[PDB]
């Protein structure tokens, strides 16, 4: 069933990451580890083969190449702290591949966003899609942006000419419970 999860037409933003539930089906993670297409194939708590768990979750989103290192237990940064946090005892795999040819636009893509401000860090597997104005100062914002009142989401602006570290990457996080 992975065919429609990896080769999907459009992925979700990292702040609004999508979760697909996969329970008891056909799977062969041997053709994925052997693939140079996947820039990242790293598993935690299990070594990358044909074991058995009751359920599989497929979390998918898009970030940039420099941020793929944050999709791992015990990491800090924009993505790990404000967008997608993996627990320390995470048991699963993280898979990523360069999606520049799909998610990058000349002049910048406006469809993929990431949370820029948040007063506290996300709990593991917490999903925050609120668009409340971030109050950075003591003075309360009343829904209007300004000094110390910033919009919490920012656009990646993916461009094909960007450095590979700033190019879009589609990430799939498989967790086994």
């Amino acid at each position, epitope marked *: 069933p992975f065919g429609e999860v990896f080769n999907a*037409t*459009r992925f979700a933003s990292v702040y609004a990451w999508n979760r697909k539930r996969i329970s008891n089906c056909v799977a062969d993670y041997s053709v994925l580890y052997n693939s140079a297409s996947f820039s990242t194939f790293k598993c935690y708590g299990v070594s990358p083969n044909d074991l058995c768990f009751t359920n599989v979750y497929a979390d998918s989103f898009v970030i940039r190449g420099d941020e793929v290192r944050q999709i791992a237990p015990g990491q800090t940064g924009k993505i790990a702290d404000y967008n997608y946090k993996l627990p320390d005892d995470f048991t699963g795999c993280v898979i990523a591949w360069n999606s520049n040819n*799909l*998610d990058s*636009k*000349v*002049g*910048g*893509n*406006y*469809n993929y*966003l990431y949370r820029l401000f948040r007063k506290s860090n996300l709990k593991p597997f917490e999903r925050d899609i609120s668009t409340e104005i971030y109050q950075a100062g003591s003075t309360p914002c009343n829904g209007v*942006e300004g000094f110390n009142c910033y*919009f919490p*989401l*920012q*656009s990646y*602006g993916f461009q*094909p000419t960007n450095g590979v570290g700033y190019q879009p990457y589609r990430v799939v996080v498989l967790s086994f419970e």
Partner: antibody
Amino acid sequence: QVQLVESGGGVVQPGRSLRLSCAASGFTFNNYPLHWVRQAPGKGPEWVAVISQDGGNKYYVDSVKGRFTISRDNSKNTLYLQMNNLRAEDTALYYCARDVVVVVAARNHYYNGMDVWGQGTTVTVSS
Amino acid sequence: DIQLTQSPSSVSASVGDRVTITCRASQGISSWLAWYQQKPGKAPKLLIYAVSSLQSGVPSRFSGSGSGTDFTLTISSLQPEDFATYYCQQAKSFPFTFGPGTKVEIKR
């Protein structure tokens, strides 16, 4: 009013040159990339070239690559297209158009279409 | 070099009809497509950008949808000033390519 007025077209022998100008008013000129689009008689529009806000980035259709040069004078609110080594298939009505800037989360995204078009200026390449 | 095809090439409609024009891209272009209306002797007019974002001043009877390779322009109730040629333009990469156009003709 937001307005683009192009000029400088006319009849020119093949292989010779022409310079088109585009006078903009009604908007902050240096906040917008600018396109040159042409339309031959009876055919649909064909995008020719675009230049960024500061003039640092320029893109061209392969048909005009190496012969046309786009440029802009932000102090004069004027866009230029320098056409050299003209061919018969360059005969068309030439528009200048302003880039569509998509704003998401207060960030600007460029090259999303053309929203303000001029009236066009005709060039005719013939001996 | 992304090609674009439109169907149909011409449409014969009356005032009040629902008119749908489609645009097919040779590769996926996400949401980066615009629609233009052009009348004889006039410059193209932008109606919709980003697949479904009505340009300011365009009546709401115009709508647009699509994603990837297939896109649709819909006129809910055709008004006399809507008989024109319509073009679809992609903006994923340069060169910006237009469609061949669809002429909306008066049925009689």
